[PDB]
Design a protein around this ligand. Sequence first.
Ligand code: HEM
Length: 399
Amino acid sequence: APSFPFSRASGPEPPAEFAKLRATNPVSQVKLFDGSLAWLVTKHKDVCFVATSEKLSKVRTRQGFPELSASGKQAAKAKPTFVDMDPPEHMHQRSMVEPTFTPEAVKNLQPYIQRTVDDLLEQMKQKGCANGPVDLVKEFALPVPSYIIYTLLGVPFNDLEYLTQQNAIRTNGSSTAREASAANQELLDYLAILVEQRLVEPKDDIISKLCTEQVKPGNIDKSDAVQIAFLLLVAGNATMVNMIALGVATLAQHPDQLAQLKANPSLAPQFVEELCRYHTAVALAIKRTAKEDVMIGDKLVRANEGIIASNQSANRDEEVFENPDEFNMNRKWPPQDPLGFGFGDHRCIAEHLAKAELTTVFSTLYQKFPDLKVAVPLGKINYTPLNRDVGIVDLPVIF
Ligand code: HEM
């Protein structure tokens, strides 16, 4: 049994092991950091099964849960939020914050998302690049998702820049454990204050709705509200940043596709669809423990055994997506759902918001800067370490 998680084959590539497993051993055992074994599922159909089976659990206090690191094992000791819950607890808490993320709500949020993107791009243009390239991540990919989620949560305008930087520090690869932790605890402290304030004078934001609708009636306590708000912030921000950066890098790698997008920004939705399939930046979230014996393919997963269903591998499943390793924004989509946002009950709560942010970015970025170019050879892109989910640390650009 090989050690898992695997390392990416290269900066922009997924681990090389998956393709081989899908072809000769779709459901197999892998060895985790603590020496325990877990079942690795690599085929689309099997990943979908794992994501929806009622015989599988997300509760991390169950022995056998596939924690992939020492930190994950310690983090599993805290009171859980809906991300680590099973029915009926799961939807009971998730439904407390779903309103802002529904397809209808996101459609109505479009003008705000567009203004946020327009403002950040204008700021970038005014700063210019007359003295050399600027970091697309720091100047654009980071603030876009950050400002939006912070604003939706309830953070006032003047606090956005500092809070955006602090949240970045908690996941920055250059941060020391001490710094990441400090930033983490600081964001929690700040959210605690916001909850106290919104409890007194509610405004029109997520935190206020949690206070008025859940805390006051006694459905949850203040700390619960803080943790729910915290989850909404840290769950997908870093991923959004990385997806925007990867999108720009990808377009640079395939000139004709960029030419097509520039000539027709209406193709942004399909470009985003392909991006979320090709670059599965959240590939280690579909994990479970078997509550009872369950058969998957030619294997029997016994009660209390862990399972990791790779949506990354599923998105490269040749049986579902023709020429899976080819990035094609004009891809002819099959009836099967690509799995960039998961599947089943737990499917990303912000899938629609995320897609809206990405679509707004890629339908506007090259209209603003038609000559935007990465200022370093593409082969020198600074990607996240290979033993981590795919992403980009910084991206020098000129325009
Ligand atoms: C393009 C960026 C994003 C990608 C690719 C992404 C992908 C995912 C994936 C794969 C999961 C696992 C779903 C499953 O268990 O089947 C997930 C869960 C989740 N994501 Fe995201 N996500 C993104 C953006 C966001 C944003 C913007 C937020 C916050 C506003 C967010 C909040 C969450 C939460 C709260 C969960 C847990 C849902 C649950 O367990 O019920 N995500 N996301």
